[PDB]
Amino acid sequence: TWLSDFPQAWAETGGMGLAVRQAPLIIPLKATSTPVSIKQYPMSQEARLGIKPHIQRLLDQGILVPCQSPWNTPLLPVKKPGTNDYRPVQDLREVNKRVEDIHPTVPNPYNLLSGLPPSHQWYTVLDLKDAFFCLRLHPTSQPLFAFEWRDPEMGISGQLTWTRLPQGFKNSPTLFDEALHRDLADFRIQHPDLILLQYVDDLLLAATSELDCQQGTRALLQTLGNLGYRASAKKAQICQKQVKYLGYLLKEGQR
Amino acid sequence: TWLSDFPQAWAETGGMGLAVRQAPLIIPLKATSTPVSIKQYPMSQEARLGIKPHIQRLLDQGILVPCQSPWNTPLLPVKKPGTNDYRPVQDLREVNKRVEDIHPTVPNPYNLLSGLPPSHQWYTVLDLKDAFFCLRLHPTSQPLFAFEWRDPEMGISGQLTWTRLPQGFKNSPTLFDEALHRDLADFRIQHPDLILLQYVDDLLLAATSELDCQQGTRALLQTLGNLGYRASAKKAQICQKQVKYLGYLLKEGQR
DNA sequence: ATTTAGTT
DNA sequence: AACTAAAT
DNA sequence: ATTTAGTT
DNA sequence: AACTAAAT
């Protein structure tokens, strides 16, 4: 039982993650940027009620904190179903435009998979849960991602912001990918025979023998857990001959 | 008085032209072409009355003749003014598509004018009237350009066609330009010092001295008249230092 | 609620 | 230029 | 009266 | 995709 031997490595039994080895991230602005404050678009009670539980959970988790900032972007009520449950989606486009660009270092899936040799037939796929939220944001950069939150009946001060790398920020995928690479560098050095592919929060470990894949997976889960990341036990594909990775179906070394 | 010394050369005093040296033109069809017969679109009495005098004049001139043909294209009532006088415009597009293409040998005005040296400052401009109609169409090709004509009160048999190169035919400008070049080849050889530019029916004669331009123009008018072409006395610009040719204003050797 | 790159 | 489709 | 290449 | 502009 992998879930039992590695309690800390799974999102199911390890609690929200936090990359303890990673220094809080500082987000540099473009040379001429000035704060932009876009008023919150009026939200219906339906959308607000649907979103509230999520905001509360994040505040309880310390991922969202009250603040007073010259920056402000609108929260969008987005429901996946035909018209069911709502979830908060922040429109950070005006913030993204004022943030200095960085080199896109995340490889496209096609090129990433090209590094998978035929020799390693035993695959293991893990996806990290709430990956961006595992990376802390430096207090100086936190104000940048502020939005307004007002509960008609006892609403928070006014604005809330993130203490972790947020969704909707143009550099999140790249910064997370680079941070995880730094954290798993040693693991790669300690396991020369293993093949590890990283695509932001989607990991593929490849070994030659079921045994290698087994021991390798134990080591990877142990490492991820200690670093503060959390993998989804529900979606985990362990030591399989066939697995689904990045939209592909890896079987017999195909795709 | 040029109009008096060259009666035959002017459209005003020489009658409709006819290039007597040019063999009637044979129009080759594309390898797979078959006759196309498009019914005449109903025409209002207003348009018909406006067009009638033109049709009658052409029939009197032998330019239009009755016929029975498997080919037929529509006549369009087109009035230049805001809604005044109508004139017949034949829609020969379906005929054009079935006629074999020929190399476009008429040079564009820009390139044509590049052959005008600074030495020849005395210009003479003539435009031939009803140029295409001066070229006969071989009896075998005449049926190709048939259209319907019916006078509510005593209408012609049915169809009429052209005995001369028609307007609206894709190869008319090129075939006329090549025919005139053949007819004026000798003139060019007999006047080495003169510069003659031809753009379909628009002619520009350039000389070094007013005298040369004078004698040259007399010779050109005499030649055109004898060949069966007719120039517009009204629009004629003779031995000028400045003239309008092909939309350009030739002055001092400029443009 | 807005933007934007595409399509029609 | 009026519509779609994506995207935050 | 229809077509067509362009624009909006 | 609804409109224009030319063209025969």
From Swiss-Prot, chains A, B:
Cofactor requirements of the protein: Mn(2+); Mg(2+)
The positions annotated for binding RNA are: 41, 91, 93, 107, 171, 173
| Residue ranges crossing the lipid bilayer per the database entry | none
How does the cofactor attach, per the note?
Answer: Binds 2 Mn(2+)/Mg(2+) ions for ribonuclease H (RNase H) activity.
Where is the Reverse transcriptase domain positioned along the sequence? 59-250
Q: Which domain of life is it from?
A: Viruses
Q: Where is the signal peptide?
A: none
Binding residues for Mg(2+) 1, per the UniProt record? 127, 201-202
Q: What does this protein do?
A: RT is a multifunctional enzyme that converts the viral dimeric RNA genome into dsDNA in the cytoplasm, shortly after virus entry into the cell. This enzyme displays a DNA polymerase activity that can copy either DNA or RNA templates, and a ribonuclease H (RNase H) activity that cleaves the RNA strand of RNA-DNA heteroduplexes in a partially processive 3' to 5' endonucleasic mode. Conversion of viral genomic RNA into dsDNA requires many steps. A tRNA binds to the primer-binding site (PBS) situated at the 5' end of the viral RNA.
Q: What else is known?
A: The reverse transcriptase is an error-prone enzyme that lacks a proof-reading function. High mutations rate is a direct consequence of this characteristic. RT also displays frequent template switching leading to high recombination rate. Recombination mostly occurs between homologous regions of the two copackaged RNA genomes. If these two RNA molecules derive from different viral strains, reverse transcription will give rise to highly recombinated proviral DNAs.
**Subunit annotation:** The reverse transcriptase is a monomer (Potential). Interacts (via RNase domains) with host release factor ETF1; this interaction is essential for translational readthrough of amber codon between viral gag and pol genes, as well as for viral replication.
In Swiss-Prot or TrEMBL terms, this protein is called Reverse transcriptase/ribonuclease H
At the highest ranks, the source species' classification is: Viruses, Riboviria, Pararnavirae, Artverviricota, Revtraviricetes
- Note the residue range shown relative to the complete protein: 683 to 937 of 1738
